[PDB]
């Protein structure tokens, strides 16, 4: 019934007014018919009543409703992009003197926010290995306020054992807020909230929008954390425009058919790479032998199309250019989760720099791929040709 | 030549590509043709080269260029709304242990951000009377990092003596960052940067957009503060979508003809109110006898259409409803700076609550008006009828 | 009450705004019916503002249609993809093989081409008349004349019709003719066409209504007599405009008053300056005494927009033309007008003579058409002055 | 290479994207010319993809036009405000008084009305033929037959033409006829019309290309022979579509492959289930054996979309109809289709007979047209099953 949910989520007549999709209500000013009306709207300003553009319009309400039902939360807070969702969700719960524990495989910008912004506000941050599991207790402090997860990890794709981590945290620091950047799973392939996680964050910019033409971040919360996140993010003036909210709801409608193709094509490519002479290792959660594959197998209900692989040799600058500059279908660009295929290379030294309190375990050049909606055989042919360029 | 500047600001062929207005480039992913291309874009990521959607696209660049030339700054940082611009600009420069000095007539949400968010991060905030001038030195501390101004003040409209305040601050704490919420002047009726102010903030949501259908905040900085504000706001993931950037640039084109009508109509209404039997006081910067009128006369080059007046009596709930609920042209709504006229009432007790370390000097109900683009005589007739309702 | 108040409020009812200041944008082809009863009700009111199908429109279109009827005083408003579509389809809606169309020879070129290239092959004939013919238009009327098409001021040359004289003359001879007017220059508000006995007022909303040169749309406001026929025949031709463009047009109306006033003020100042210039032969501005039809404009219009033209004393050659046009700093060369920026275009006498059917032009020098935008007028005059220097 | 790869890359050249993944949105009427030389160059290439005027298009439109020509293999692509406009204007572009139009009697109703209500008054006659006439179409040809209009599968009843037989028969008799097809059901990619000798392939992009029921647009992809005439005559009629809609249509193409595959898979499963149901008289699905023209579909198409119909054994009365239609939880009643959601509409035999000119219908029970969206198929079957229970 997921497909059925995706097609219907948030589409009440109150929002569509007769149309299939919700209407787009662009507004800062929202008019009150009377003093009585104004008083009522005021009282329900954080409860879906038209009050002020910063709180949202019918278009935003429709998206919030859809996200809460898809991820099973009490509320949904909207942001300008995924990076704003991460930074502001963390900021909403911290206080001078707190400690933040974050996975060392977290998205680089998330790490930078902690080391460059939080540090000057009297908050300390330490990091942990993605596969630590129950041993995370060794990193917990009396003042640990937030435990930040990201599974699979950025670039390297390690999958956490969430159940083990959550149980350990609750036993030591019950009051801690556990958050996860659930972008890779598009919030649906891993129901973070069903695992005891408090806040599920997404760079909707990725798979939810699915066409690389809009930026937006979402944070779906359980009942315990909703109010504080909502009100604090509001004091920071966080919101997203009505048109982007519309575009995101629209992207949900094809999320099912898209994820299924991404899953099928990426796995086929992964298995092919796994048997290629020039490849040292394939980092795909759905592929046996990948770090944390056992957990992906147990906790996820599917896979998206982003993964990486390690070459047997470390390419030099000339080789890198020759390899990358001549692809016919894969394009070099940041971001992912769109309809087209992308390729990016990372030298071992680059990764080591962004793995705080951790160590890298490979020496060849790492290639990150996003498998789009093109014919998988055309993509394999392109990759095959690329290897020949560096043979 | 202001009118000429408004029509041409930011419209280089690089952004328009043959059209009158800049193109709308919606994007998260921006493609690099080669490794050499990627390296170059990386190097100029904060210098107008296409790199990643969060940094901006051609559409954002065009708006940033227009704002810098209109306000005379070194750079322009974009935000989701005016409240985000205020909160994030302050956050970009503070550190645990700092002190923030803010006018007590500041926009309520700005005050709340300081008292509810900054307080928990070890930053203290104290407030000052708008008309203090050179005596502000009595409030300066060794750790005063930011001095926040808003002229005219929200609701009550007091105008600061900016030159006196800036000279005093520089003489005592040279390193302080002086900011001003320059929304009422739409950034053009008061050239904040020419007065020694470091950052000029605007809720572009107001007069720049001018049609009440988009939300966006802007911060134009001098050379001294640009880099820190730009990079720190970036770590917080602040940005605005491409379509809203387009809409804001579009609003600039009619800013001149709009402000001129708002100025003419609001003054006529103000002078009429000033002579009405039921009115105790009129708070319009351009009207003699208004608090700080001497400074408006000296430092501003015009007026917009927002102002307030105080009735001789304090209306009770029944009277309030009867007065407000029966207007034919004025509508009750938050926000302003649009093409239509708006009305809001505030009881003396309500204002006193939002005037920290200050005291109110009126006892009648205060009415805030935004004079739109309707025929001024029709608006006066509507007001006249309203008074008769409470006689 | 007054025009400015009407522009700010037209079409903005709660049913369309739903609490916001502007109408909501309802993008749709499919419109859902809750029950068979609802579908029945919708079908019966499909042309009366009830949600039925995207081609008929959504709340966004209904809001604009209401705003337009209010502003121009019509019974109904039909929407098209652009002004040219409004012209071609409005004419087509009323003709049959064997009919005759009488059009002013100063009509917008594309409108003329529609008649001579398309209508001609469907058995419809077109003849032309001089803009200042007045009551003498009776001489061009035929028993099969179905449509009399006006355009005042005329395209490029700006001649103003004596509409009252024309309408009365046509009605005395062919009572049931359909009189239409391309009322784009007046933006539908500076000349109230329907108050003068005209049946259909057409506008390229693309110009002043949108006012920012970033959207295309055509409108046709009809009286009670012609509404149903135009609406239904345009519908069979699949004519419609997208929801977002309807929203942007409604939005343009809000500043139409303040914009037109500035366009009026600035263009007249530029016209008067040009009138006293040594290199200028004549200025064609409706508001300027001596201009063709000036007394009619003075009598029938309530204002002026910013488009006009002037004739140079000399006919520039290719080299002079490039040197003049290529070096302007504020004025740009482009088609269309009615936006916030100033534009300039040049036409040689021979170009104009070719598009003035059954008529003679009255000038020999190069004609320059100017659109005066919202820039500072003194900066504009300076740019023009520098232009004259490149020609002396 | 393969279809999926083409859909992802079609029209996405750097000239249109400028570094982004999708084409930029260039909203405009006015397009600025830097010099007289530039204006000259633009004028000469105004119909060859050079920026000239908004009515001709901007970079956004050019990108879509290129994508469409690539996908359908044509020389050019003409854009319209909606599918109905594409049909009406494409026919109008090629006719003159005295011509004859031969159209399938299963044509979309609005297309039929255009011919009988508009064309008739311009001296053009229209006759009709049965969808399965095949090579016998020669019997309906006249010396003045200018256009043969096909639609396969037919609207509502879904009959599939034997196109190869029809085209060859027409060409043997009237070599220079213009053969057109409303190729909306196949989304232009499931049946390559131009490869079969058809001159113009028309689509209501409003359906599957947009795929989300929130934009309206019509496209006409022509062969080299008919391109200039269709392009120029549609231009004189002021036909165009806005930049934002062009962008949204290009965007729709990217997921067309994954969407159509799901629509194909789900509708066939629903069709087979319906085929074995006690209350179902017959299922009209092109992919189902026994359906009219099934062997032609099997032979000429490369897939199926999600729209089809079925006939109930009984003809429901008003009470039964409401009880059946009003109580569906997943299927909604609405016009249009090709979106992500499932729709349902009912038609009585007498309704259909009225829109089947010079033909006889072959059923007596109530006909239900279904659009199978992207919802879980088992949930859809359950909703339908509950529907049958309200009728037993």
Swiss-Prot record, chains C, D:
SUPFAM superfamilies: PLP-dependent transferases. Its EC number is 4.4.1.13, 4.4.1.28. Keywords: Amino-acid biosynthesis, Cytoplasm, Lyase, Methionine biosynthesis, Pyridoxal phosphate. The keyword Hydrolase does not apply. It is found in: Cytoplasm. GO terms for molecular function: alanine racemase activity; cysteine-S-conjugate beta-lyase activity; identical protein binding; L-cysteine desulfhydrase activity; pyridoxal phosphate binding. Pathway: Amino-acid biosynthesis; L-methionine biosynthesis via de novo pathway; L-homocysteine from L-cystathionine: step 1/1. It is an enzyme of class 4 (lyase). Its main location: cytoplasm. Belongs to the trans-sulfuration enzymes family. This is Cystathionine beta-lyase MetC. It comes from Escherichia coli (strain K12).
């Amino acid at each position: 019934k997921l497909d059925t949910q995706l097609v219907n989520a948030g589409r009440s007549k109150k929002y569509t007014l007769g149309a299939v999709n919700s209407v787009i209500q662009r507004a800062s000013s929202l008019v009150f018919d009377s003093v009585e009306a104004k008083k009522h709207a005021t009282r329900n300003r954080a409860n879906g009543e038209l009050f002020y553009g910063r709180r949202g319009t019918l278009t935003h309400f429709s998206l919030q409703q859809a996200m809460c039902e898809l991820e099973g939360g009490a509320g949904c807070v909207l942001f300008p992009c995924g990076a704003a969702a991460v930074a502001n969700s963390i900021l909403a719960f911290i206080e001078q003197g707190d400690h933040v524990l974050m996975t060392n495989t977290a998205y680089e910008p998330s790490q930078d926010f902690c080391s460059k912004i939080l540090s000057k506000l009297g908050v300390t941050t330490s990091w942990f290995d993605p596969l630590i599991g129950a041993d995370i207790v060794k990193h917990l402090q009396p003042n640990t306020k937030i435990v930040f997860l990201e599974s699979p990890g950025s670039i390297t794709m390690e999958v956490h054992d969430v159940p083990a981590i959550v149980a350990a945290v609750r036993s030591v620091v019950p009051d801690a807020i556990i958050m996860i950047d659930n972008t890779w799973a598009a919030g649906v392939l891993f129901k973070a909230l069903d695992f005891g996680i408090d806040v599920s964050i997404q760079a909707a910019t990725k798979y939810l929008v699915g066409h690389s033409d809009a930026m937006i971040g979402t944070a779906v919360c359980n009942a315990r954390c909703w109010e504080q996140l909502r009100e604090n993010a509001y004091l920071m003036g966080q919101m997203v425009d009505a048109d982007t909210a519309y575009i995101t709801s629209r992207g949900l409608r094809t999320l099912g058919v898209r994820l299924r193709q991404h899953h099928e094509s990426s796995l086929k490519v992964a298995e092919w790479l796994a048997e290629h002479p020039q490849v040292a290792r394939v980092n795909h959660p759905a592929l046996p032998g990948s770090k944390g594959h056992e957990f992906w197998k147990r906790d996820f209900t599917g896979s998206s199309g982003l993964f990486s692989f390690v070459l047997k040799k470390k390419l030099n600058n000339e080789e890198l250019a020759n390899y990358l500059d001549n692809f016919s279908l894969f394009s070099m660009a940041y971001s992912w989760g769109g309809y087209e295929s992308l390729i990016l290379a990372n030298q071992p030294e680059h990764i080591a720099a962004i793995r705080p309190q951790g160590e890298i375990d490979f020496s060849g050049t790492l290639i990150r791929l996003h498998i789009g909606l093109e014919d998988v055989d055309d993509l394999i042919a392109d990759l095959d040709a690329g290897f020949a360029r560096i043979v």
